[PDB]
């Protein structure tokens, strides 16, 4: 029970940290209960306590019995695709991660109560807002993608796809303070970096188009999707396509569509 | 139990409604089972029983029962948000609001068959048609909004969000003969006004977007989204930002983007 | 039981082509289970077997089986619109064609690993690509618009349009090798014509938009959806409107406005 050893000592980790939490991040209502996909419904439990228990049922055992249910959940699908001794590595990799995503997913709420105006709260945020739902599921698919799992991942986002509308490849490196408001339509590639303070709209693409060449069969992978600096918004409908580097403190306009380096401190519209 | 007086009550109305219904709204067929998220589930049985029931159920009596179990509901989640007495509050005028909410989702099937050259009749709308799904839910969480209330109404419509990929605040105002097509990606904010005969396509927002500024936190609310008139027609992809004013008989053409007022009586291309 | 014996000669056919398959149509995995809506899961474990079943189960007596079920359940649905007679008529249709849709569902297969560098094999494709499930159930929901049917094929794909964001109407023609990478807020007419490997992005329309008259009640069906060639690519957003003629060999740029015929060989951009 070596992984079950391991599994204590980050649920410890995390409930300390939610005792440490600021009040923001906390409540003492008892929220109504919702059924969603497996891996969003164990996350929101596992770092969100408050808002998804049970406030009878909030301690340190409980966080670590969610935790193990997500972590047998996760190592089955990946013994699934791949083996059971790969599986067992990239879930000691997610349950390494989890204080370091706690702590993103602090900032990407920050970003998301300060860039939306009809917010009244991060309670209201961290219980139903899509972007932030999706952005939960995809930090923790993107470290199995880091540990080279190119199966579950994918399924895992397609779940938050179907749910969100939100089309974030698990390959994607995205930093803190990430907003997506509304988020319909929004599709961020495999190969796509975004940096800190990144705020996209409705159907934004960051992404590629592959024009048919033949017919052959495309090249798989490679960097082909834009890179994006800090303290970005991209507007409504914006496709930024291509491997194209969009600097700092970069604006797009409604509708834009963007194939070349746009660069930093500009407002881009026509 | 007063507020159990005042369901039967109407209950009461709202199946003298049902009976004095147009041939159009009405049905004799046993349509398949379904099941959806619990406020449509619910407002479907209500409003329009002969395309939700089990022809042999349709009475008063199961108007009430349905009634009953969707302000059980509607006002334990408000109560869980909020408080008892606001909840309480909140679902009377709910309840009071549900008869002149039934005659205007009439108006609404009778926009979307007159708009929609594939729709065969009222009963697949009524059945199956996402933009009246959505409207359905809009119509109540924007009785909850007026009562004052900004947690489980935005919730509400996180659920229409999440079964529709339309993204309706339930703070926007709406008014009759409404009618969404296809409705992937339609984005209506928190102050949106929009007025009679209103056709909105796939992927259109009448919205608004908020440039970083520092960072500093946005200002909350406030009048900023667009208010539309009358007669208006807006084209798949159309981006309407803003706190400006689209006048009456507009036509916006597609993958616009309108940041300015837009007169009465005209056409917008480029 | 003489529709019980057209689905035993049906299944086995499906089941001959099964064991015929390249083996990049195979698998010995035991894939993790899910449950989607009816159509999807039924088609799923018939056409994909190693995918969606239980190795230990995969037998023509089984596919026969999840065969039945399906019949049964679009029978039932069929009748629940229209009467026994017609319903019965429709899925002896269904069956007939089975066997080609399951040869044209290889080259849609086939098609989307050969345009999406991001995909690792067929199996990720077949077990969540949200393009190819919308693909599965419309190419049997097409069958029923063939026989006649006007309701219960357009409940089948808003089923689709609710879990993937993709919106094709039943009574579209499309041929094979076709892909729709990302795929939300795809829109695909009644009467829109779609050649051979035909390749869709995020946020395409092949469609139709109906500027308000007065208002009358608009004209019914009619063809006024777009015919689109062959080898056609259309980038993310573009809005390919009316009865109008796309080429072979076209590509379609981000954000296009396409209202007019376009002709072969020749690429759109602004």
Redesign the interface.
């Given at each position: 029970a070596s992984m079950d050893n391991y599994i204590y000592s980050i649920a410890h980790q995390l409930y300390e940290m939610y005792l440490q939490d600021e009040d923001a991040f906390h409540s003492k209502?008892?929220?109504?209960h919702k059924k969603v996909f497996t891996e969003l419904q164990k996350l929101r439990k596992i770092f969100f306590p408050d808002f998804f228990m049970k406030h009878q049922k909030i301690t340190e055992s409980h966080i670590a019995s969610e935790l193990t249910k997500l972590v047998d959940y996760i190592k089955?699908?990946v013994t699934?695709?791949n083996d059971e001794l790969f599986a067992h590595q990239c879930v000691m990799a997610i349950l390494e991660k989890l204080p370091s995503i706690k702590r993103t997913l602090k900032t990407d709420l920050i970003?998301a109560?300060?860039?939306?105006?009809?917010a009244?709260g991060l309670?209201?945020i961290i219980?139903?807002?899509?972007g932030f739902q999706a952005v939960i599921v995809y930090r923790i698919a993107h470290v199995l993608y880091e540990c080279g799992e190119?199966?579950?991942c994918?399924?895992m986002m397609?779940s938050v796809?179907?749910?969100?509308?939100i089309?974030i490849?698990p390959?994607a490196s995205i930093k803190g303070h990430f907003f997506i408001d509304?988020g319909?339509?929004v599709?961020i590639?495999?190969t796509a970096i975004i940096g800190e303070?990144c705020?996209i709209?409705?159907?934004v693409?960051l992404?590629?188009?592959?024009?048919?060449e033949e017919?052959?069969?495309?090249?798989?992978?490679?960097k082909?999707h834009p890179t994006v600096g800090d303290?970005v918004?991209i507007?409504?409908?914006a496709?930024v396509?291509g491997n194209i580097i969009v600097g700092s403190h970069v604006?797009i306009?409604?509708?834009?569509?963007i194939?070349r380096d746009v660069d930093s401190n500009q407002?881009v519209y026509?």
């Open positions: 209502r008892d929220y109504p089955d699908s699934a695709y970003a109560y300060a860039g939306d105006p009809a009244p309670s209201l219980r139903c807002y899509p190119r199966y579950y994918r399924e397609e796809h179907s749910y969100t509308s089309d490849h390959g509304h319909v339509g599709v590639g495999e303070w705020r709209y409705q159907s693409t992404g590629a188009m592959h024009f048919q017919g052959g069969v495309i090249k798989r992978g490679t082909r303290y918004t507007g409504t409908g496709k396509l604006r306009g409604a509708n834009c569509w194939d407002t026509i």
